[PDB]
From Swiss-Prot:
Originating organism: Mycolicibacterium smegmatis (strain ATCC 700084 / mc(2)155)
Keyword 4Fe-4S: no
Membership in a protein family: Belongs to the RecA family.
GO BP terms: DNA recombination; DNA repair; SOS response
CDD domains membership: RecA
HAMAP family to which the protein is assigned, alphabetical: RecA (MF_00268)
SUPFAM superfamilies to which the protein is assigned, alphabetical: P-loop containing nucleoside triphosphate hydrolases, RecA protein, C-terminal domain
The protein's assembly and partners: Polymerizes non-specifically on ssDNA to form filaments. Interacts with and activates LexA leading to autocatalytic cleavage of LexA, which derepresses the SOS regulon and activates DNA repair.
Protein name per UniProt: Protein RecA
Keyword Repeat part of the UniProt annotation: no
Binding positions (phosphate): S67, S68, G69, K70, T71, A192
PANTHER family the UniProt entry points to: MITOCHONDRIAL DNA REPAIR PROTEIN RECA HOMOLOG-RELATED, RECA
An example molecular function term from Gene Ontology annotations: ATP-dependent DNA damage sensor activity
Length: 320
């Protein structure tokens, strides 16, 4: 009478119908639900996400050590959303944003809404009023940790002191997430690990996607400062199989290196060969050293585009 596989499908099906698609999924599964996304500005990461970008209408958490590249990703997403004629908001509670760097990543700063809330309640509230207006594509909340409650900001006593920031962060998410769905606005919460920073407790359960951004190498190329190599881990992903990993280089002054990506992604995926030290493509000499090679692809843009193309084919191409 029992047939495991059939029995398992009928179960999973009900799991998803009861809790939403993605509630349960085989890891090796290959998803064919092309959702609307905002390219992360990181091809590898886009593929690692399984849907080629951050899903629209969801809460995304990008936590990690300082300098690890979080903000760069967030901003890159913001640019990608604007390019697609999307409106982006930035709830700043750290006062660290460098608009000049943001322009380099490609963001249209002049059209970017910016707010600097008085208290955490205000911040989330403001961001919430924005979201449910339907005009936004993406909204960014800089520093989960800086969402300090009003009662703490205003001189309040050491009594009645409670994990209010968590509650604040919990209550706030409860109502915004639904609004985000209706509006289809991606919500990135930058969490800078120094509960995952008190309020990160709730976010963990509300986030549809969670990215563990981490600094792993100091791009040297040769013996000198250029940038840093980041490593993101999709620890949570309610819209594709989770736990995938991506890596990319972020050069100083510049954002995520496209060419860097390509050379990387081209290699593992065969198209480009590293005979050992030297890099080559379709028998074309590229250069000794990821950098000489990187440079190559920046100069000879005719290559690189056919490569990005070859890679965009073997992986994520037009669907349905
Ligand atoms: N103002 C800037 N000028 C040049 N390079 C920058 C600047 N800001 C960021 N970068 C580049 C080089 C850094 O190694 C890399 C990481 O910075 P950021 O992208 O700000 O890291 P982060 O997102 O992990 O830290 P955090 O989110 O806690 O502020 O980004």
């Amino acid at each position: 009478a029992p047939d495991r596989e059939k029995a398992l499908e009928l179960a999973m099906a009900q799991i998803d119908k009861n809790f939403g698609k993605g509630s349960v999924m085989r890891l090796g599964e290959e998803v064919r639900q092309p959702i609307s996304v905002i390219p992360t500005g990181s091809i590898s990461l886009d593929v690692a996400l399984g849907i080629g970008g951050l899903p629209r209408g969801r809460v995304i958490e990008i936590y990690g050590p300082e300098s690890s590249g979080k903000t760069t990703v967030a901003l890159h997403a913001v640019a990608n959303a604007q390019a697609a004629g999307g409106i982006a908001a930035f709830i700043d509670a750290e006062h660290a944003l460098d608009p000049e760097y943001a322009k380099k990543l490609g963001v249209d700063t002049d059209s970017l809404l910016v707010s600097q809330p008085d208290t955490g309640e205000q911040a989330l509230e403001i961001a919430d009023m924005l979201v449910r207006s339907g005009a936004l594509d993406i909204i960014v909340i800089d520093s989960v940790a800086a969402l300090v409650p009003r009662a703490e900001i205003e001189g309040e006593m050491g009594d009645s002191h409670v994990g209010l920031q968590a509650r604040l962060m919990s209550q706030a998410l409860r109502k915004m997430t639904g609004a985000l769905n209706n509006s289809g606005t991606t919500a990135i919460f930058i969490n800078a690990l120094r509960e995952t920073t008190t309020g990160g407790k709730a976010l963990k359960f509300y986030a549809s996607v969670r990215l563990d951004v981490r600094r792993i190498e100091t791009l040297k190329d040769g013996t000198d400062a250029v940038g840093n190599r980041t490593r993101v881990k999709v620890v949570k992903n309610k819209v594709s199989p989770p736990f995938k990993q991506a890596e990319f280089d972020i050069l100083y002054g510049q954002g995520i290196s496209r060419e860097g990506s390509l050379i990387d992604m081209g290699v593992e995926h065969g198209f480009i060969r590293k005979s050992g030290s030297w890099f080559t493509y379709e028998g074309e000499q590229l250069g000794q050293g990821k950098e000489n090679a990187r440079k190559f692809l920046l100069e000879n843009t005719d290559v690189a585009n056919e490569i990005e193309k070859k890679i965009k084919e073997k992986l994520g191409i037009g669907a349905v």
